[PDB]
């Protein structure tokens with residue numbers, strides 16, 4: 001249930017999220033009102049989850065980034081870890097995952113020493129063991145593909 | 148230099164990418180013209196690299212997501228795998244990593260079967276072994292934190 005017009009909108013809004021209703025309208029061949037109203041439909045079903053500035057983590061002082069795969073110390077607590085980690089500001093993402101581990105987190109931090117303190121907070125707040133994979137360089141990210 | 152007037156701007160823009168040069172200024176104790184200005188220099192200095200709507204990937208047909216860890220097969224060739232995979236569009240992100248593999252990709256795809264295809268394509272286009280980890284669920288993604 002996603003027509004051609006809706007495809008053009010989400011493609012445009014991936015590429016440019018500050019773009020304005022009139023720009024959008026003249027690109028989809030619609031009135032600024034039919035645009036507004038379609039864009040509100042997108043947002044209220046779950047198609048557009050919100051809108052964000054892409055910030056350079058380096059520039060605001062997150063010089064170390066890492067993947068941390070976490071698995072439950074006792075796999076019979078009911079599974080909680082995403083809820084309980086939600087309040088560690090430095091966890092940016094949390095996925096559950098098939099395989100030997102249960103979740104993968106992407107985490108950003110000031111330095112090597114700050115990473116060790118965060119790994120302790122993690123181990124303790126979700127009661128979890130950790131496997132860390134430091135990122136050396138990001139070549140490109142979030143490049144959303146609308147087919 | 149990141150005058151923590153600029154911090155509140157980016158905390159603001161991070162949570163609301165369509166927040167308006169107008170309604171920003173009140174949340175921030177500046178003028179409409181002062182506020183708009185920095186934003187233009189914030190983007191200039193590469194601190195805000197872009198504005199995106201966060202699209203839900205299932206809702207656009209991407210029912211299976213995976214991290215795919217790759218490592219080049221022949222160490223005597225130049226290691227240029229991000230450049231080679233860059234044209235392949237279902238790769239959304241590519242990181243060099245300090246781990247077992249040389250790189251991690253995040254990849255989205257229509258089904259299990261389409262993944263198998265995409266992996267053969269990754270293997271023959273870069274020249275790499277693939278080891279891949281299916282994401283079951285995204286609890287939260289990209290919550291940017293500004294110290």
Ligand code: MET
Pocket residue numbers: 096097098099100101102103283
């Ligand atoms: C996030 S549920 C844990 C899944 C587990 N890693 C499995 O493969 O069975």
